[model samples]
Target: SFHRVDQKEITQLSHLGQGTRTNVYEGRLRELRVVLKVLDPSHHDIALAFYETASLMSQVSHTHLAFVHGVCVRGPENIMVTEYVEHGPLDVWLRRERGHVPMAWKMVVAQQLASALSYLENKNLVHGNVCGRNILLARLGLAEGTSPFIKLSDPGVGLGALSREERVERIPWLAPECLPSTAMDKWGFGATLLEICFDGEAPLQSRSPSEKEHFYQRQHRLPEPSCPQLATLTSQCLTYEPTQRPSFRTILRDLTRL
Candidate 1:
């Protein structure tokens, strides 16, 4: 059975998200802000997944990804702790803002995210679920007067012994082959890039899940929607063929040119 944890024992900052398997809580540990993910007893697999992800993240050292602060294994509970990205996830930031994300800032964020992906690609690892939720925003490497930078989260989501999220993000950002494999991870990265460039929107032939699948199945086609140059690049990530998609290395190079 599940029980309500003490809000006083842990200063609950905000409810990050909730799923059938687990509940993600934002909280403070002493003076440090950390994320506490509580998995339901019935969903032991999620707890295992969280621990696996945390352990893997701890081993992978990268400038673009968030560090795994620690993990707590109580008798009846599994709590995974990690560095609380001050800016939180990109999805939260994008939806609340009034206007489009500035291109300059988007470039900065995308560059960092791409750099992380390149490292993972080289390591033969795959971040099965790449999105605003997995990519964290922070003030890393920023000068005193300059704006903060971005960081990647859940670097080990699908790469190491972990399974993909039952639900992936927007249909337009996924590659055809991503139904299962490293290639799909690349598409997820592209979706994240698209969101940053468009302030959390994607250009797809259809938004409905079934219609989206039918559109992809009937023809290996993508809409030539009129969008910003960077947005188009992100859309290109959803190529019908994984081989046709640009590598994260290529993305960084093109972003540099832009």
Candidate 2:
């Protein structure tokens, strides 16, 4: 069971970000700094879905996955308390810092992310969303450091929760079969890997909608990466046939070797 967090104990430091399903805040949970995800009150069904998913996520523990501390319920709102990463979201970090972060560290981030996904796979859970926006980086300690530690967030809500337009909009990163279907963890991971390599550029963002659709249907491949090994791995992960995609364990093993 998770801790029952009192809303009063959560002192919001700042607004971290927002997603289609919830709003994120940097806050202190009692004495510890935590990331709070406040479920959108307007979307009652989404909120209820997240609550059920959060309960299950809180029970699982893995070093690379974000640690869920507790749940806070106040009237109609449901808040999830998770450990705060000082560096914030990976997308923001890449955009702000750019080429400053070493390639070695990026590899570490990729490996750790793969490790987390593999752990979740073992538990029969899919992260549903595995984009750079959902990835957070933490240093070795409270102070800033070179070590890049990854903690993935936003688990549970399936593809059905998002609209087809939204899915099509994200086509560059998604497998052709992902839209209107839930089996997309591997393809999403490949897209995320592309994001890391390009320093936050969304997959196929440069291409026109028609061009992207053509590439997806005809080519069935991800955009080529600068690194050949990574390109190969990402291509394998993004295989058109979901059954042909590598397992998270296989990806993690390859990443570890790299």
Candidate 3:
């Protein structure tokens, strides 16, 4: 089967996901379930972005990150090959298992996720998007209690020496300061933490345009959870002012202490 102008790769179809800029497909390559992200060339610059992403990924390799395998350019069809995790996106996976997954599982996922973020921060890089849809879980070996771990994916809109405004646009989880500073990445990490605890859901549910206006005008407040330690840390990550958000390295240390 073919999608758009490009002929689809004939492989066992595993799953499909909906992304704003790309269609994520899970297919087999040499018996390996690999992820195929078909980026739209019409709406935005896919080729340019893919090339940049490849360039960036090649420079950094970590166990917590999903490494890029290769890219396929066929006329108007551009498919980026990446390590495919069988469990799929964290959001869908968490929803499927619900309460069955214990709290330690959450910490395992969070620590690895934080490590990946720390890696990027060390490079002076900021992953503009760090939401539920961007992480995948890998099941551990035959050992019990050691089930799955986390890997950061879809590092789209990475700001590597780029100015703040150039990297910020239409992202919901962004901290206010991210618009002009590298600190915006931490705001996204805070959102990631929320997902880990809340079964892959965003902290802020959908709001109508009118409601958003009314809420903002009234200086609406966000819900604060009960945990004092979590509340303080989450607040730092959710700081409206970007300059105040803590670094990924700092978050990693905090998670380790807990």
Candidate 4:
């Protein structure tokens, strides 16, 4: 309950992205570059959710999960500080570098994310958020042909309590049901697989939402994957029935054989 950091120590470097209930920033904590996720102060429910996130984050240590530095909880702000991954989010990297990446490396990233998520399942926990951005990559451009180290970020979801509007907005990455379960994470995994396996089109990117929901809801599957190689596995993860979705255990096994 006590590893607290003062807000004064973190030097805000830049704005990274915005979470539903938190403001994300790239900051400097002494010698280390860190990410600061600060929650809105006036909302009690949001505060509780974030506190839970902090507690859960402090409990585990895994290679694919982002490492938390220290938490700052005060009247004006509540912050979660974490290590900065230099290569940044997966989606952006894939899109920007749309040339060609070895399929083996893609499988490695998938397995790495699966390893972390599976570890969470073993701990009787789940990553409420699982997506390309929530996962980070390290040593991306190393000339030694080393595979990038994948790190899953956000142990607890930043969502406070869902409003229908926010739920609709979040549908792209989430499973069909807003229910927070491992099955939900699998949906995200499939969506992220879609994000990774193909760069030209992001079905999740939704220039249209109604069409997307209709397709997923009205017995229409994810249609087709980028190529047949990953199609079956992605299809399994995106399977219509939540109960039918494959767990990270199966995913890891399949990825190894890739």
TM-score of each: 0.77, 0.86, 0.80, 0.89
Stretches of candidate 4 exceeding 4 Å from the true structure: 141-144, 155-160
lDDT of each: 0.64, 0.76, 0.66, 0.74
- lDDT: worst 10-residue window of model 4: 155-164
Candidate 2's residue-wise lDDT over 6-57, tens digit each? 8888887888777666788888887898888887764666656676667767
**Which ten residues in a row are the worst by lDDT in model 3?**
1-10
Per-candidate clash tally: 0, 0, 1, 1
Candidate 3 C-alpha lDDT tens digits along 157-200: 34443343333332345554443357876877776667667776
Which clashing pairs does model 2 show?
none
Better of 1 and 3 by TM-score: 3
Q: On residues 1-258, what C-alpha lDDT tens digit does candidate 4 reach at each position?
A: 426888787888788887776778899886788998877664777677767777777788997888888788777778889878988788778878786766666776777887887888778786667777677877684455677887888744444465556665665566776723657888888877777777524575664667656665675666566656678888898876889988788887887776
Query: Best-fitting candidate, measured by lDDT?
Result: 2
Model 4 lDDT, residue 121, Cα: 77
Order of candidate numbers by TM-score, starting with the best: 4, 2, 3, 1
